[PDB]
Amino acid sequence: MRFILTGVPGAGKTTVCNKLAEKMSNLSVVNYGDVIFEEAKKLYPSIIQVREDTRKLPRADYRNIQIEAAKKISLITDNLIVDTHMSLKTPYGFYPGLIPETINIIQPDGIILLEFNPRDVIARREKDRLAGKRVTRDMESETDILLHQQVNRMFAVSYSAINQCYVKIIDLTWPQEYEFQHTEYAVNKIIEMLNF
Amino acid sequence: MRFILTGVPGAGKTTVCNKLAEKMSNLSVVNYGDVIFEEAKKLYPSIIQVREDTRKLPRADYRNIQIEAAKKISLITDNLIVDTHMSLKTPYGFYPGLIPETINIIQPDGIILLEFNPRDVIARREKDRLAGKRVTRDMESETDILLHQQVNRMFAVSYSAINQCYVKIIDLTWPQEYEFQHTEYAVNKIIEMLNF
Amino acid sequence: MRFILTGVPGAGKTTVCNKLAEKMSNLSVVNYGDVIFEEAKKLYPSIIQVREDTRKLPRADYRNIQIEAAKKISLITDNLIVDTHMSLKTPYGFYPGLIPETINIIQPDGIILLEFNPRDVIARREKDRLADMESETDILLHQQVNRMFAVSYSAINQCYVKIIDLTWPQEYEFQHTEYAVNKIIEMLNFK
Ligand SMILES: [Cl-]
Ligand SMILES: [Cl-]
Ligand SMILES: [Cl-]
Predict the structure, then answer these.
(1) How far apart are CA B93 and CA B100, in angstroms?
(2) Enclosing H/E stretch for A153
(3) C92, C98, C104: best to mutate for the B interface, most B CBs within 10 A
(4) Closest Cα partner for A182 from A193, A172, A169?
(5) DSSP label at residue B45
(6) Ligand nearest to the CA of B83
(7) Secondary structure of chain C as H, E, C letters
(8) Do C145 and B167 touch (CB under 8 A)?
(9) Which end of chain B has the smaller Cβ count within 10 Å, N or C?
């Protein structure tokens, strides 16, 4: 089966992905943005040296990279999880995170949403900073993060209404008793789904 | 007029549909799942014997059954109440009950959502389980039921944005003053709508 | 840039439209419903005399009016705000205010949703009625449905959806209106 895996930024989605790939050998885990960067660096070596250089491309060029990355991903034949985002926040508001072409090509069975308590997102973002993984203190409010998660749920349901796919919401909003518990719980739920 | 009538499983929607079917002239009340089962048995007598057997068909064959069933329904008569669901919960997540071909073929004027208080759904499911009517073993929490009702709301509005149809939300979340008041209230709001 | 601006009726959206048009010279602010009624009178003049007269028309005739109105608006050059409704409540339920052709023709960069505390909506409605009231729970429902419509259109049309939170308590009069006006100007002047 094929699932898109989503969640607000910096909340633990990467860790879930890495843990899934460590645990299940019957599974390929890919990060869409990384595949986009790699395919872009192949075609535009002069402009794209690091993942964030993707912002510099002209629209006609960026769109064709997303399509090409999706085609590359769709060559995978066993279980697949694609790490990406339901929406991005910009000054103009939220913008959908999947182009319809991406879904037409990958043909996901469903969308998985990791939903957190916004305080845990603020804290994870700051811990990632103290470990080096990001330069500036994130200043999103609990309110802004909740809004994002609500909007993401609506995007996922809309994509399901359009394309007929599962919408799997994984509740990680409860308090952790021990460290890594949210991540461990999500990984096991995804594995059990895949092996059902 | 033609309306798709929906709500979470086992909460009273079937009773509303049975009462509409007895009380309204010039109107057919029909259950999409029933037609699907009947068409499935017509075309696959070897595999389809119990209505659970639909689960064993390849998804492409199940979809073609859903098209055939919508075609049968649209031919029945002019005014229709189509009892079905916006989504059902599965091990892979919520999955839409309709396909686009359903709405294209039936051309509903709108979607009706019967919305219940989760505590009343829990009690009603257990009452019906004890009486031998409801046999959906898994017991859901209050928060599970509210999430389902929210997702159903999102599917219905998505379908309206795509197909320009009404979204009618019937609030049955207040406490009943006598047994079966919710059913009677919902029936009369629907009849009042159909004769406006 | 072009945005559709929406919110539940009677909550202050018109005031925001007026003050935007007044505080920004290079901006056109158009009310879709007004253009629709204009085109309706011009095509059905003996039948159409006030705006609620358009509910009498065959749906295909109404739709053609909606399309003609969108074409007229799509000619406006420079920044533009189109004041309209994601949905209205009817006896048959909520019904979308736009048709897909409206978005297709205007090609908005995005949708802007103004969101209010329900009791502030009730208050404003009375201050213009005195001159049947929905409950707080009705208005909340209407706002949640509008959000769902806007996100759906965003997914279908690949456009922005901006939510302007005006649910906090006003510390002085006019503060909600001023805040939304300024957030939208800030948006139109972004680089
Ligand atoms: Cl992460
Ligand atoms: Cl029932
Ligand atoms: Cl107003």
Answers:
(1) 19
(2) helix A142-163
(3) C92
(4) A172
(5) T
(6) 2
(7) CEEEEECCCCCCHHHHHHHHHHHCCCEEEEEHHHHHHHHHHHHCCCCCCCHHHHHHCCHHHHHHHHHHHHHHHCCCCCEEEEECCCEEEECCEEEECCCHHHHHHHCCCEEEEEEECHHHHHHHHHHHHCCCCCCHHHHHHHHHHHHHHHHHHHHHHCCEEEEEEECCCCCCCCHHHHHHHHHHHHHHCCC
(8) yes
(9) C
Q: Tell me how far apart the alpha carbons of residues C134 and C143 are, in angstroms, rounded to a whole number.
A: 13
Which among C90, C99, C152 has the least Cβ separation from residue B157?
C152
C-alpha dist (Å) from residue B62 to B53, B86, B87, B155:
11, 17, 16, 21
d(CA B134, CA A7): 36
Give residue for tokens 């051309």: B107
Neighboring chains of B (3 or more beta-carbon pairs < 8 A): A, C
Contact B133, A132 (CB under 8 A): no
- Whole-angstrom distance between the N-terminal and C-terminal Cα of chain A? 11
Cα distances (angstroms) measured from residue C136 to each of B113, B166, C155: 20, 22, 29
- Name every residue in C having a CB less than 8 A away from some CB of A: 1, 109-112, 147-148, 151-152, 154-156, 158-163, 165, 186-187, 190
- Report, in angstroms and rounded to the nearest whole number, the Rg of chain C calculated over CA atoms: 17
Q: Whose CA is closest to B97, among B50, B142, B35?
A: B35
**Ligand 2 centre from A14 Cα, in Å?**
42
| Experimental determination technique | X-ray
Distances (CA, A) of B176 to A115, B18, B115, C120: 34, 20, 14, 30
Give, in degrees to the nearest 5, the angle at Cα A79 between A76 and A80: 65
Q: Mention every residue, 6+ apart, whose C-beta is less than 8 A from residue A52.
A: none
Q: Could you give the CA distance from residue A136 to residue A142 in angstroms, rounded to a whole number?
A: 18
Tokens 């009498």 belong to residue = C56
Residue in chain B closest to C99 (alpha carbons) equals B164
User: Which positions ≥6 away from B189 have C-beta within 8 Å?
Assistant: B170
Locate breaks in chain B with C to N over 2.5 A; list the residue preceding each.
none
> C146 to chain A: nearest residue by CA?
A154
User: To which H or E segment does residue B173 belong?
Assistant: none
Tokens of A178: 């021990």
- How many other C-beta atoms are found inside a 10 Å radius of the C-beta of residue A131? 8
- Resolution expressed in Å: 1.9
Radius of gyration of chain B (CA): 17
Cα Rg of chain A, angstroms = 17
Cite the DSSP H helix spans in chain B. 13-23, 32-43, 59-76, 100-106, 118-130, 142-163, 181-194
* Contact of B40 with B118, CB cutoff 8 Å: no
Q: Which chain A residues are closer than 8 Å to B93 by Cβ?
A: 110-112, 166-169
Number of Cβ within a 10 Å radius of residue C48: 20
